[PDB]
Structure 1
């Protein structure tokens, strides 16, 4: 698939929706981003950074009216340059639950509460994208 990739989420997200993204991190990758969008707002930005001041960190945030909010940072970093990955995002009633390569990684509490209006997922960054799909569990 071509990156950046936009995956429509028809009728928005709902609890029990599972989104699965398969791809490979490019060699010498700098960043990856998943952006769950509510119009111009970003309800959930998931942003692995491979070199922020020589550290590897995952930054999560929300953008409202073009302003970023308080960052939530995770030091556990399961991505590896050059290697294949699987990201699974499970929508639960009160948070997005993210697993990478079948291991739980983090939860992100819903800041944008109109879940039905979060109707696009943007996938960008330094990856080769193999598949992006959803199902109900």
Structure 2
């Protein structure tokens, strides 16, 4: 189920932060934050905290296939507790911060950064805020 979508047709990468605040409703499900590229609505970056297994899975869906999963060692979420996820892009990576701690970096696989125009947030997250900001 789609919880939030945003579209910035001029391109929101690189040099933009997305800050999502919210909490899960359960400790048995998952949510995802997806950055999509145009045309094709391919998934340049898929950020997928899975609470049933306490794993953050990151990947990209390009040319009709998921790539190699990048799975973080730590799981700094607590079910039903408010969190803040910030995703900031530079020329080389998406940088992920949770509750103001840097957690992981994901190297760009979709190199056409300016075609990343859309953000989708799906599944088990009760959103309290989404901020999309040009950092430089």
Tell me the TM-score normalized by structure 2: 0.91
For 2:114, what is the secondary structure of its paired residue? helix
Q: Deviations over 1:88-134 (max 9, x none)?
A: 01111100000000000100000001111111000012110111121
For 1:116, what is the secondary structure of its paired residue? helix
- The aligned residue for residue 43 of structure 1 is 44
Task: Work out whether 1:100 is the aligned partner of 2:98.
Answer: yes
> Higher mean Cα deviation, 66-75 or 93-102?
66-75
TM superposition shift of 1:29:
4.2
Distance in 1 between residues matched to 2:42 and 2:13, nearest whole Å: 18
> Higher mean Cα deviation, 25-34 or 100-109?
25-34
- The aligned residue for residue 126 of structure 1 is 124
TM superposition shift of 1:59:
0.6
TM superposition shift of 1:15:
2.9
- The aligned residue for residue 78 of structure 1 is 76
TM superposition shift of 1:4:
2.2
Number of residue pairs the alignment of both structures matches:
133
Task: Give the aligned CA root-mean-square deviation in angstroms.
Answer: 1.5
Stretches of 4+ aligned residues off by more than 2 angstroms: 13-16
For 1:108, what is the secondary structure of its paired residue? strand
8 Å contact kept, 1:36–1:118: yes
